[PDB]
């Protein structure tokens, strides 16, 4: 199962020139293009090997369209200051995402487009790709504007067409990197904790893609509560790490089993300390 997403963030800096703009693209968890207005010569640049086969006409158009985007979003920051009655004193952030998911197989499974202002949902294209959800009365203005301009019909055409076409291409081009499954290396650690208890921590390391399910069971029963599960984190080499921990009575450690599910495993692993 696979996805393409573009993201952008426009960040104002009062009295220090125009807002900063970044834009980036991903296939699954892999970044493949990036633009930063803070660069000496801002342009869309490659971030994965498999996109480097695209020619100069590609990079020039992506660059051209992203600069346009930057300028539009700098205006949008001004408009939103107006909607929310905000002064020129403080910095604000406007974030955007667009993308498409494939399941199996070939055509669009779900399209997305969404904006956030100052860290909160603002306006989103509904799953129907025909209507919009506004978070408040300011976003209701933007919605009415999107309706009058027939934006959804345009965005639907991109999502059902261009987005899916190019995701397919990148997945093929980057097939060795993007269509792989590297199973986690797993183990459990044990440490006493005070009051006749111990922490059992189940580790998963070096896996790709990031999706994984770590579950603790006592006596073969999934422990929902009381499990600490860390956020999946990058190793820095293109793989991921995660752990899950449970605190158990000393003398009862053997009654606990960790269960790891990942696409790269032939079958789910069970581990017991």
């Amino acid at each position: 199962s696979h996805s393409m997403r573009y993201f952008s963030a426009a960040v104002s800096r009062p009295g220090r020139g125009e807002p900063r703009f970044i834009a980036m693209g991903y296939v699954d968890d892999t970044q493949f293009v990036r633009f930063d207005s803070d660069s000496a010569s801002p342009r869309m640049e490659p971030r994965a090997p498999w996109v480097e086969q695209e020619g100069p006409e590609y990079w020039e158009e992506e660059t051209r369209n992203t600069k346009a985007h930057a300028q539009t979003d700098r205006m949008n920051l001004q408009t939103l200051r107006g909607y929310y009655n905000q002064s020129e004193a403080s910095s604000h952030t406007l974030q955007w995402m667009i993308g498409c998911d494939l399941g199996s197989d070939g055509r669009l499974i779900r399209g997305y487009e969404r904006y956030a202002y100052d860290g909160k949902d603002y306006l989103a294209l509904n799953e129907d790709l025909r209507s919009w959800t506004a978070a408040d009365t300011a976003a209701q203005i933007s919605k009415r504007k999107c309706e009058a301009a027939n934006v959804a019909e345009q965005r639907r055409a991109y999502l059902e067409g261009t987005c899916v076409e190019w995701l397919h291409r990148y997945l093929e081009n980057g097939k060795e990197m993007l269509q792989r499954a590297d199973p986690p290396k797993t183990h459990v650690t044990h440490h006493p904790v005070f009051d006749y208890e111990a922490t059992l921590r189940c580790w998963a390391l070096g896996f790709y893609p990031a999706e994984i399910i770590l579950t603790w069971q006592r006596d073969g029963e999934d422990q929902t509560q009381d499990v600490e599960l860390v956020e999946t984190r990058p190793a820095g080499d293109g793989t991921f790490q995660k752990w899950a921990a449970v605190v158990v009575p000393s003398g009862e450690e053997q009654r606990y089993t960790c269960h790891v599910q990942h696409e790269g495993l032939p079958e789910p692993l069970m581990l017991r300390w």
Partner: peptide, 9 residues
């Protein structure tokens, strides 16, 4: 590939 158009809020 990015979309070609970006819209006004």
């Amino acid at each position: 590939k990015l979309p070609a158009q970006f819209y006004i809020l």
